[PDB]
Design an enzyme around this catalytic site. Sequence first.
Site, mmCIF file in Angstrom:
data_model
loop_
_atom_site.group_PDB
_atom_site.id
_atom_site.type_symbol
_atom_site.label_atom_id
_atom_site.label_comp_id
_atom_site.label_asym_id
_atom_site.label_seq_id
_atom_site.Cartn_x
_atom_site.Cartn_y
_atom_site.Cartn_z
ATOM 1 N N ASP A 97 9.072 4.190 3.201
ATOM 2 C CA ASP A 97 8.745 2.893 2.621
ATOM 3 C C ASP A 97 8.473 2.862 1.117
ATOM 4 O O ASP A 97 9.010 2.008 0.410
ATOM 5 C CB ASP A 97 7.561 2.266 3.368
ATOM 6 C CG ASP A 97 7.763 2.246 4.876
ATOM 7 O OD1 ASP A 97 8.918 2.342 5.346
ATOM 8 O OD2 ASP A 97 6.757 2.117 5.600
ATOM 9 N N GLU A 109 5.603 -2.802 10.471
ATOM 10 C CA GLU A 109 4.198 -2.454 10.306
ATOM 11 C C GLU A 109 3.330 -3.695 10.462
ATOM 12 O O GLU A 109 2.221 -3.627 10.995
ATOM 13 C CB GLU A 109 3.957 -1.817 8.935
ATOM 14 C CG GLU A 109 4.436 -0.374 8.851
ATOM 15 C CD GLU A 109 4.164 0.263 7.502
ATOM 16 O OE1 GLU A 109 4.435 1.473 7.354
ATOM 17 O OE2 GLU A 109 3.679 -0.446 6.593
#
Lengths: 261, 261
Positions: free
Chosen positions: B51, B164
């Site tokens: 990420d 997430e």
Amino acid sequence: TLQQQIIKALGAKPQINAEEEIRRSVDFLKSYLQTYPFIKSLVLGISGGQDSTLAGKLCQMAINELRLETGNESLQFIAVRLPYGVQADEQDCQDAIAFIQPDRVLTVNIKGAVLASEQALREAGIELSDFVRGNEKARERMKAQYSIAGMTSGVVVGTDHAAEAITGFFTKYGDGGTDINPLYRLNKRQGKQLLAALACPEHLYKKADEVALGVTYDNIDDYLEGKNVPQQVARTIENWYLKTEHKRRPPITVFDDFWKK
Amino acid sequence: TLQQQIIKALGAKPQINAEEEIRRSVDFLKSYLQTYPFIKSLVLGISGGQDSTLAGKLCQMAINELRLETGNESLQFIAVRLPYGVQADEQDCQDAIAFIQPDRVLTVNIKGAVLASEQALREAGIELSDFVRGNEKARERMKAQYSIAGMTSGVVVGTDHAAEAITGFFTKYGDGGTDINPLYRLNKRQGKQLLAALACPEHLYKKADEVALGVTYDNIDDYLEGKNVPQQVARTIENWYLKTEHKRRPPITVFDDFWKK
Ligand SMILES: Nc1ncnc2c1ncn2[C@@H]1O[C@H](COP(=O)(O)O)[C@@H](O)[C@H]1O
Ligand SMILES: Nc1ncnc2c1ncn2[C@@H]1O[C@H](COP(=O)(O)O)[C@@H](O)[C@H]1O
Ligand SMILES: Nc1ncnc2c1ncn2[C@@H]1O[C@H](COP(=O)(O)O)[C@@H](O)[C@H]1O
Ligand SMILES: Nc1ncnc2c1ncn2[C@@H]1O[C@H](COP(=O)(O)O)[C@@H](O)[C@H]1O
Ligand SMILES: [Mg+2]
Ligand SMILES: [Mg+2]
Ligand SMILES: [Mg+2]
Ligand SMILES: [Mg+2]
């Protein structure tokens, strides 16, 4: 008008009933705890100032009532003192605690951690200004409260209200980083009204922000009550509001468009 | 269905066009900076993981393009390394930096500050569990980044994405405390798709959360893509979503009612 839109967004009213608002906030806290039974503690930083003294009293009242009603003795209100070295108005904090009569009071001195953070940044090449150091202190206080809530099955109570929300006069993810805000909707003078109704010692809220703002709290409160204030004053307040919208919303994504207006 | 509502709320799609999404994120960052000209820097913590490597590359591309287009040489991307003592996958971080080619890289070791915070809490009577200490580290990283942004006229970039956000797998006011999130909407495998399109070294995103979740990232990605997954899997994901709604909204006030359902 923009004044009308802001008043609506913050939920402010021209006049309030002190006792009725006290019950609205207390019942709010009680309802939340009954909906999420795993929460056993309410955590709040006490500074000796008006807002935290008010929020603190409401929190203790909420817990006091829940204990008697459910018989659950594990519930408790945790007041947290977070001085940076030696706090000036320490005696005021003591008086505030005597007024609130908290179940528990923990004292955590944040000076060591702040100095450590600054040393690490200095070695990397970043020296902080007094303004930035101030926000850093607010964020260390947030950190301490969340660590306490994490170990006591609690939630962090915030003191944010309409008079502070309108100008974004709080540290992003600092004192602005909380879980539940029972004072949201009230302006500054209305907060004093609630304290008077609770028989709070006058010196704890009788006069103390207005420097950096460019407007007084009376200007802000009058504006929030829908009153006609000088145009220059209205423009200053509105400028602050528009400039700080990012503080009253979640992180910006490709789907947001408020910042495009 | 709840699956339909969640997909809509997070803005996830069954399939995406890698290059098109790369441009959507880059153009987003560029537009924001042109709208708020006082912002001169983009700040992002680099961990060596998927990420942050992706977000980092997009940030540098945005700044690279803005410089050439406006001629403003003061703009810059600041990558921040925030190790806790000695980080394990340090070599991966070096490879990530080589791939991103950031304008500036600052290294701030957060260990000293975390230990200081823990000592202050210990003296007050609070000992932290490993889980809570983990969140504390995430919050110290947030603090460091905001202090850097404060001194460099910048904003803090976040790496939050659909895979997430759906489980609330981030620290509240920790890595979740950011200003702008250019990856929001993408699921996990789609993030890999963007990295492949950017010619990112495979080892930087080729396999590494699934332990605490009770579901794998493939289950989560499939769910976000609107696929039919086992009912038990869907219920687990949905349980996490409902339980963490407080992490995706501003502090709770007397006006909120989402928690009452
Ligand atoms: N010295 C302190 N001790 C504990 N809590 C603090 C301290 N200073 C600020 N706070 C907390 O931060 C909130 C916001 O403060 P203010 O920045 O004055 O709006 C207060 O209502 C307190 O909950
Ligand atoms: N217009 C903006 N959009 C998004 N974030 C911003 C903007 N202006 C300021 N910020 C962030 O908010 C911080 C200032 O908030 P504070 O620390 O509360 O004074 C800056 O250091 C940036 O990280
Ligand atoms: N070791 C680290 N160094 C710098 N940034 C970090 C570190 N660990 C976590 N972060 C930041 O926190 C974000 C969230 O991480 P994660 O907790 O793995 O979802 C990453 O995308 C990074 O921006
Ligand atoms: N249902 C809830 N409503 C509001 N805040 C909560 C709730 N559940 C957890 N929290 C807060 O969020 C923290 C857990 O988030 P994290 O630190 O990200 O793991 C707890 O320490 C509480 O402060
Ligand atoms: Mg104060
Ligand atoms: Mg205050
Ligand atoms: Mg990671
Ligand atoms: Mg991540």
